[PDB]
Amino acid sequence: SRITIERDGLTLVGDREEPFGEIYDMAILMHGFTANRNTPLLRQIADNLRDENVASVRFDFNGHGESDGAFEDMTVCNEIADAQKILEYVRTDPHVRNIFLVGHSQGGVVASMLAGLYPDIVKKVVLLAPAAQLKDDALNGDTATYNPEHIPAAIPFHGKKLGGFYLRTAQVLPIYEIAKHYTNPVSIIVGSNDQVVAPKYSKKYDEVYENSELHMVPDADHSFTGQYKDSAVDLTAEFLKP
Amino acid sequence: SMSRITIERDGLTLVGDREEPFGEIYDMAILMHGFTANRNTPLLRQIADNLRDENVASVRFDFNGHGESDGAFEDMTVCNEIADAQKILEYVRTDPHVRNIFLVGHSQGGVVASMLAGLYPDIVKKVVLLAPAAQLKDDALNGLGGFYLRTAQVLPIYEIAKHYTNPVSIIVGSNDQVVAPKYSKKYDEVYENSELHMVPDADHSFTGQYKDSAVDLTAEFLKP
């Protein structure tokens, strides 16, 4: 069912899904850039988790979906703050037992960074085509292009203006630095035909994590479109089966 | 003239004091306080006036969870205070009355200023750091919200800060018992264009006569 939480005066909208029972593990499900908390990928994860007794939360990040905040005011850092506030509401739920994180694309960056900040609280992590390229995209100019040494107050996209503060913080994000601090198990799932995030980024998480595995879905794209969604849902509920 | 201005940041209202010299065009300094303080301590209130009298305008805001500004102190982090200062920077950036933008930060607001300049080294033209609390990172690593402490342990203070290569002045009191003087020296060393000014016998808050010496050194660096 439907829940809301506040972070710095903005409201975040999410959906909560529960299995039969008073106590259960709980996964926090994080989407990617310009996406929402109702992509097919995340809902099928929420349904399949529920069938193996894993509750789950999935929220619209600030500036996305039904949550508050202009798109051009989002950064990966206030998204990390969004996730800290979902983590805390989950952490105070008397029905939650263990806490898992599940992020796709830019949400996988968020998940891995919250995990390195909370390595003692988060017991398993699933990164789904995590988008660490965004730091290298910000440093280069193309994410079309711009000038990475004089970045404007916003760069036009599809109507949703991308804030210049996202880019400047994207360039200096300590993505792998913070994530290596998490030594509990990590499953990384990537598609063999992902044209959005090159292989190196996932292969780099696998080599930096101390307790990780890197699955590859043949022929799968960045989004895990259609049939590819099943192989990514299967792997993710595999990893999280209690 | 002096003004009260408000500002929004993710739906939280931040509360500031704008002080200007009489004219249509001038430089301006953003002045940021430290943890537990507010925009209107004697030291920041003094730097504002001395600057007003050098044709250097100034705004000073209460950080989120501080003074009059919105938000709880437990929800404060060094990252959301950067995001406060960024919103103020955008504000200042968008005044046709502003020529050059300087940053000034005491204690924790000095870490914030060093990090906002490291992100905006094309826009920020001059920085003055008074007793920068870069030690908060090492305090958090050895042993106020839990989120403040978890991010403080992994803050890349010097590594962002160093991308700023315009002139920066670092003024510490020599008898600081809050932040080791060792943190003002790593700043002056990693900065490609900086200067160290130690005020003998001054404490971390630069009180009494030491406030006057701190605002002299501050104002004479930002002086045009």
Q: Is A210 exposed, middle or buried (0-12, 13-18, 19+ CB in 10 A)?
A: exposed
User: Which sign, positive or negative, has the C-alpha torsion B15, B17, B23, B25?
Assistant: negative
Tell me A57's DSSP state.
E
Q: What is the rounded distance in angstroms from the CA atom of residue A21 to the CA atom of residue A23?
A: 6
Check CB contact under 8 Å for B120 and A75: no
Nearest C-alpha neighbor of A189 from the set A125, A114, A110: A125
Q: Resolution limit in angstroms?
A: 2.3
Q: What is the rounded distance in angstroms from the CA atom of residue B223 to the CA atom of residue A45?
A: 60
Alpha helix (H) residue ranges in B69-201: 78-93, 108-119, 136-142, 146-152, 157-162, 182-190
Which one of B119, B150, B154 has the shortest CB-CB distance to A177?
B154
Q: What is the CATH number of domain B2-222?
A: 3.40.50.1820
Min Cα separation B190/chain A (Å): 17
Which amino acid, A173? L
Q: What is the rounded distance in angstroms from the CA atom of residue B221 to the CA atom of residue B63?
A: 25
Q: What is the rounded distance in angstroms from the CA atom of residue B207 to the CA atom of residue B43?
A: 8
Which amino acid, A128? L
B interface with A, Cβ–Cβ below 8 Å: 9-12, 64, 70-71, 75, 77, 79-80, 83, 86, 90, 93, 118-120, 122, 147, 150-151, 154, 156, 159-160, 163
Q: What is the rounded distance in angstroms from the CA atom of residue A154 to the CA atom of residue A136?
A: 18
What torsion do the CA atoms of B73, B101, A174, A59 make, to the nearest 10 degrees? 50
Tell me B75's DSSP state.
G
Question: What is the token pair recorded at B47?
Answer: 């730097």
With b for 16 or more beta-carbon neighbours within 10 A and e for fewer, the A86-123 pattern comes to bbbbbeeeeebeebbbbbbbbbbbbbbbbbbbbbebbe
Q: Report the Cα B13 to chain-centroid distance in Å.
A: 19
Q: What is the rounded distance in angstroms from the CA atom of residue A46 to the CA atom of residue A90?
A: 15
Alpha-carbon distances, residue A101 vs A221, B44, B136 (angstroms)? 22, 43, 29
Alpha-carbon distances, residue A150 vs A71, A153, A158 (angstroms)? 21, 10, 22
Q: What is the rounded distance in angstroms from the CA atom of residue B64 to the CA atom of residue B95?
A: 23
Min Cα separation B71/chain A (Å): 7
